[PDB]
Design a protein around this ligand. Structure first.
Ligand SMILES: *[C@@H]1O[C@H](CO)[C@@H](O[C@@H]2O[C@H](CO)[C@@H](O[C@@H]3O[C@H](CO)[C@@H](O)[C@H](O)[C@@H]3O)[C@H](O)[C@H]2NC(C)=O)[C@H](O)[C@H]1NC(C)=O
Ligand SMILES: *[C@@H]1O[C@H](CO)[C@@H](O[C@@H]2O[C@H](CO)[C@@H](O[C@@H]3O[C@H](CO)[C@@H](O)[C@H](O)[C@@H]3O)[C@H](O)[C@H]2NC(C)=O)[C@H](O)[C@H]1NC(C)=O
Ligand SMILES: *[C@@H]1O[C@H](CO)[C@@H](O)[C@H](O)[C@H]1NC(C)=O
Ligand SMILES: *[C@@H]1O[C@H](CO)[C@@H](O)[C@H](O)[C@H]1NC(C)=O
Lengths: 61, 61
């Protein structure tokens, strides 16, 4: 996972083939080592396209 | 997939590294051999966190 100046993309480690990140690539490993990317839940969709928080949207809608 | 007395977790088979189950680990293989876990669709979220049934929630909301 890397950063092309405000745009996050995912590529391999052997060849350079960029694409966009999707939800099926992430797991959940509780408690957050320090050297991660600080981001709140509201702006998470700017990292992962095609991720809609059902909870907060049904709070709104 | 195992059970720590009402809490379901997923670990490897070589080392013991527990975490929570997510949606990207399951496939759909129709007709249900006998020795599974009997559970209805309403309480499925107690097995899989971050699984919202869109259909029944839009029936409600
Ligand atoms: C994401 O945000 C968190 C919190 O806003 C950052 O965690 C904290 O970061 C500081 C420095 O990056 C860690 O060092 C501390 O610095 C102070 C001096 O201001 C010093 O007095 C402390 O003894 C300590 O050395 C701090 O430990 C850390 N907080 C915790 C609870 O570990 C985090 O660094 C941010 N992410 C990135 C990539 O910067
Ligand atoms: C999940 O629930 C289903 C249905 O509620 C269970 O399926 C049925 O389980 C019984 C015993 O576990 C199976 O054996 C049957 O027992 C009766 C005696 O009560 C006997 O007369 C029958 O000939 C048969 O041996 C039954 O076959 C099975 N139903 C079907 C359609 O196969 C299931 O066992 C439950 N899951 C677990 C893990 O227990
Ligand atoms: C999920 O969403 C519903 C309604 O949007 C809300 O009542 C519930 O508290 C939310 N749960 C979490 C863990 O965000
Ligand atoms: C999916 O949800 C919609 C509205 O919530 C409903 O009309 C439809 O029957 C549902 N389909 C299934 C297969 O549950």
């Amino acid at each position: 996972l890397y950063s092309d100046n405000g745009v996050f993309r995912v590529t391999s480690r052997v060849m350079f083939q960029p694409r966009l990140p999707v939800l099926s690539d992430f797991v959940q490993i509780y408690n957050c080592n320090v050297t991660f990317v600080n981001i709140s839940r509201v702006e998470l969709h700017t990292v992962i396209p095609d991720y809609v928080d059902v909870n907060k949207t049904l709070q709104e809608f």
